[PDB]
Structure formats: C-alpha cells, structure tokens
Amino acid sequence: GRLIYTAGGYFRQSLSYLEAYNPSNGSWLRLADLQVPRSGLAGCVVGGLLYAVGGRNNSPDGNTDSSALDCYNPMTNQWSPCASMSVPRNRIGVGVIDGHIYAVGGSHGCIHHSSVERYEPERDEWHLVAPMLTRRIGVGVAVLNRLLYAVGGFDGTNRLNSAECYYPERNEWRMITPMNTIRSGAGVCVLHNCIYAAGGYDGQDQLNSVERYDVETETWTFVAPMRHHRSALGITVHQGKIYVLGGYDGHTFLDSVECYDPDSDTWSEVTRMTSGRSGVGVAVTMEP
Numbered sequence: 001g002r003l004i005y006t007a008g009g010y011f012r013q014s015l016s017y018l019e020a021y022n023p024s025n026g027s028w029l030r031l032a033d034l035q036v037p038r039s040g041l042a043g044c045v046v047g048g049l050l051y052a053v054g055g056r057n058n059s060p061d062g063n064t065d066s067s068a069l070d071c072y073n074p075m076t077n078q079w080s081p082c083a084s085m086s087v088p089r090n091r092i093g094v095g096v097i098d099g100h101i102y103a104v105g106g107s108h109g110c111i112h113h114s115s116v117e118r119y120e121p122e123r124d125e126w127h128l129v130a131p132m133l134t135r136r137i138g139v140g141v142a143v144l145n146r147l148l149y150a151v152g153g154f155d156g157t158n159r160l161n162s163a164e165c166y167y168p169e170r171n172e173w174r175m176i177t178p179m180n181t182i183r184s185g186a187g188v189c190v191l192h193n194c195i196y197a198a199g200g201y202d203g204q205d206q207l208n209s210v211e212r213y214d215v216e217t218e219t220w221t222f223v224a225p226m227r228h229h230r231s232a233l234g235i236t237v238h239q240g241k242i243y244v245l246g247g248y249d250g251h252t253f254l255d256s257v258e259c260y261d262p263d264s265d266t267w268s269e270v271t272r273m274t275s276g277r278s279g280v281g282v283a284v285t286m287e288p
C-alpha cells in the first residue's frame with residue numbers, strides 16, 4: 001500500500017481517531033472517526049479495505065467490550081459495520097491468511113479467551129476454529145508462510161513468554177519455542193522470515209527490548225532495542241521496515257513513532273502522532 005493507518009486508542013478514555021501517516025512526505029491525515037470509540041482493538045487489511053476488530057469502549061458512560069468488526073474504505077472515507085464476532089474481544093490479536101481474518105484471544109470482562117475465530121469477507125460470516133492451548137489477552141499475532149502465530153499475553157493470572165502456532169489444514173495449535181522475555185501487550189509483526197516481538201509488559205516494567213523468532217532455526221534472538229520503553233503499542237511493516245506507534249512507557253502515553261531498519265539494526269524516530277495514546281490498531285493500505 002502507501003499509508004500507515006492508526007485507528008482508535010486510549011488517552012484518558014477510548015478514542016475514535018482514524019489517522020493516516022505517509023512515510024514518503026511525513027504528513028498526517030485525520031480521517032473519518034470510528035463509529036464507536038475503542039481501545040485494545042486490532043487492525044488489518046484485506047483487499048485494500050481496512051478492518052478494525054474487537055477492543056473496548058472505556059467511557060464515562062461505562063465500559064463495554066467489543067465484538068465488533070468494522071470496515072473502512074479509503075476510496076469513500078466511510079466505515080461500514082460487518083458481522084460481529086461470537087464474543088467480545090478486548091486486547092485482541094488478529095492475523096490475515098488467504099483473505100480471511102483470524103481473531104485471537106482477548107478478554108470479555110474477567111473472561112480471558114483462548115478461543116479463535118475466522119472471518120470470511122466474501123460471506124460476511126465468522127466461524128470458530130480450534131482454540132489456542134493458552135488463554136491470551138494482549139496477545140501478539142502474526143502470519144508467516146500462511147501459519148498463524150500467537151505470542152505472549154496474559155492468561156488471567158500470569159504474563160507469558162510462551163508462543164504457539166496454528167496450522168490451518170490440521171486445525172491445530174502447537175507450542176513453539178518460548179521467548180527469552182515475558183511480554184504482554186507487545187507489538188508483534190513479521191519481517192522477512194522472522195516474527196518480531198517488540199516491547200510489552202513483563203509484570204514489572206514496560207519493555208524497550210525487541211526479539212525475533214526464526215521459523216527455520218526455531219530460535220529467538222534479541223536485536224537492537226527501541227529508544228523508548230513502551231507497552232500496548234501499535235506495530236506494522238512498511239517498505240521492509242518496522243514502525244511502532246505510541247504506547248505507554250510508565251509515565252506518558254507516547255506520541256512517538258519509531259522505525260526499525262533491519263539492515264543497520266537501528267531504530268530511529270520518524271514522526272509524532274497528533275497526540276499520545278496507547279492500544280491503537282494499525283495497518284497499511286492505499287491513500288484515500
């Protein structure tokens with residue numbers, strides 16, 4: 001695509017902002033708000049359409065977990081509702097495989113989901129698949145070689161360094177090598193042949209460390225850390241570079257945006273969001 005879209009988030013309350021960043025010229029764009037404010041959501045893209053999944057509206061009028069799926073069309077600058085998931089999923093992970101959207105984990109009140117479900121846009125229908133082996137909220141999710149990985153999170157009692165992989169043709173979950181660090185609410189994405197896990201919360205401190213899982217060697221390896229410790233961040237990939245947006249560093253809701261270049265193994269600050277916020281959903285698609 002061309003732009004990095006950030007949707008929703010949290011600062012004092014849940015937010016409805018949809019803002020698009022252009023790495024080519026540095027410009028931010030404010031776009032049509034979400035119909036319902038929501039933090040802890042996840043974003044993804046299918047067929048050029050942006051999708052916001054799950055989350056939670058923390059508002060003075062109350063707190064409502066979201067089972068909602070909403071579709072933004074850059075061509076029209078409009079949000080359309082889609083079929084809702086089987087359950088509310090706050091602090092959700094999502095991954096796209098073969099044009100289908102996998103919703104992973106999340107919480108519904110004090111319920112910490114291990115359930116997983118799949119959305120087929122061509123039929124506007126969700127269907128439950130095999131549940132993970134672990135309850136995970138604040139779970140990182142990524143797709144590599146058409147395999148779905150759930151990384152870290154919180155299972156209702158402990159933050160996790162564990163990770164697992166879902167094989168669709170077998171409808172099966174299997175544990176993989178655990179991370180060297182406990183991370184909940186981390187940013188997880190894919191670059192080349194590696195699953196990157198960045199930041200998060202280990203139970204005591206917000207993390208700036210970053211590690212990556214090589215699916216061939218089945219090993220986790222730390223890389224250069226981010227400039228800012230940060231949890232509940234948005235993460236995406238643009239032109240073979242990782243972008244991490246916002247988060248919470250234990251003192252401030254960050255408007256910082258960092259960019260990781262894997263050839264030099266260096267992070268650099270590339271811009272600031274229009275305001276500090278955590279728990280955004282992030283994806284990449286064409287300009288509107």
Ligand SMILES: CCCc1ccc(S(=O)(=O)Nc2cccc(-n3ncc(C(=O)O)c3C3CC3)c2)cc1
Pocket residue numbers: 009010039040091137138139153154159184185186200201231232233248278279280
């Ligand atoms: C002082 C207030 C701190 C705060 C931070 C984030 C959010 S938020 O609105 O961005 N919510 C959200 C989003 C994505 C993940 C998570 N998440 N999930 C599990 C855990 C954990 O700590 O174990 C976390 C926590 C570590 C992030 C939560 C609201 C408030």
